[PDB]
Amino acid sequence: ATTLKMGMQASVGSVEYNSAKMLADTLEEMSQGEIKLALYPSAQLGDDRAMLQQLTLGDLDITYAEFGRMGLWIPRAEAVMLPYVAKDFDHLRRMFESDFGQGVRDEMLQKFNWRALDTWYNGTRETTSNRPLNSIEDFKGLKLRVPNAKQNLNYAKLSGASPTPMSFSEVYLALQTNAVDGQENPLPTIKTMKFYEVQKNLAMTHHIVNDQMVIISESTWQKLSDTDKDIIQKAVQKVGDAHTQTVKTQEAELVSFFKSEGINVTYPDLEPFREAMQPLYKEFDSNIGQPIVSKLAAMLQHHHHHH
Ligand SMILES: [Co+2]
C-alpha cells in the first residue's frame, strides 16, 4: 500500500482540486488500489513555495507549480512568463518539452528534488475595461489595474497603459467608480469577482498564458517500483489531457457567458503587442547573457502539431 500526499493552494470545488481527485481515482483504478492519493487543499500546508520545500525535504509527495514560477529558483525559467512569449498553451508546452525546458527540469531535479511529470493548461489572462480596446492604440490613457507582479506591470507599461497598483478586494469598487479603467485576469476570476458587472468590455489580449506543472518529490519517486512509476506518469498525463480540455472548454463558455451579459468582446491584433515587448525581451537576454527569450518566442516549428 502506497498513499501519496498531494498539497495544493486551490480549494475543494476548484478545477485544480477536481483534477487532483481525478488523479486519485485514476491511480486507484490503474493500480488496483495499490497506489492511493491523499489531498491537502486550501494551502493548509502553506503556499506553493512552502509546499515545494516540503517536496525537497521529502515530507510531501506531489504539488502543483507553474513553469515560470521556477524563475524564483532558476533565473532563466522566468523567460516563459514574460508577456507574449508563449502564444498559447501549445507553445508553452513546446517550451516545457524543448532542450531549454529539459535543462530547467534537470536542474529542478538535481538541486531541489523536484521531478516535473507534466504541464497542464491553467488559463490565459485577458483584459477588461470601461471602454472598448480594439487595438493597442486604445491602451493610451487606460488606467489598468495589475497585481503587484513584475511581468503584469511590464504588460501594462509596454502596452502604453498607465499601470495602477491596487488591492484585489478593492478592485470591484474602483472599476465601478472609474477610479481605474480596467483590469487583467483569467476569465474564471473575472466571473467569480463579478468584474463583468462593472466592465462593459473584454479584450482577448492573451498576454499571459498559465500552466500548472505536476511535480513529485524525487525521494518518493526513487522508492516506487518501475511499474508504479509508469502508472503514475501515465495517470498524470491522462488527467492532464482532461484538465487542459476542461480549462479550454470553460474559457469558451465564459466568453459566451460574458457576451450574454452584454459585454463587448474584442480581438485586438496581437502582433503590435508582441512588437511592444521587444525592449523587455532584449533586456532580459542581454542581462542573462544568452538569447533565451528570442529563441523561445520563435520556437514555433511544432506549433499545434499532433504530438
Ligand atoms: Co511536430
Residue numbers in the entry: 1 to 307
Give sentences copied directly from the paper behind this entry.
Vc-SiaP was crystallized without Neu5Ac and we determined its structure to 1.45 Å resolution. These crystals belonged to space group I222. The structure was refined to an R factor of 0.18 and a free R factor of 0.22. However, the r.m.s. deviation between the open form of the Vc-SiaP structure and the open form of the Hi-SiaP structure was about 0.9 Å. Interestingly, a Co atom mediates the inter-protein contact in the crystal lattice. Given that there was no cobalt in our buffers, we propose that this came from the TALON column used in purification. This cobalt appeared to be ligated by three His residues from the C-terminal end of the six-His tag and Glu261 from a neighbouring molecule. Interestingly, the binding affinity of Vc-SiaP is 309 nM, i.e. ten times weaker than those of Fn-SiaP and Pm-SiaP. The structural features that might contribute to the low binding affinity of Vc-SiaP remain unclear.
The first step of this process is the transport of sialic acid to the cytoplasm, which often takes place using a tripartite ATP-independent transport system consisting of a periplasmic binding protein and a membrane transporter. In this paper, the structural characterization of periplasmic binding proteins from the pathogenic bacteria Fusobacterium nucleatum, Pasteurella multocida and Vibrio cholerae and their thermodynamic characterization are reported. The structure and the thermodynamics of the binding of sugars suggest that all of these proteins have a very well conserved binding pocket and similar binding affinities. While the C1 carboxylate has been identified as the primary binding site, a second conserved hydrogen-bonding network is involved in the initiation and stabilization of the conformational states.
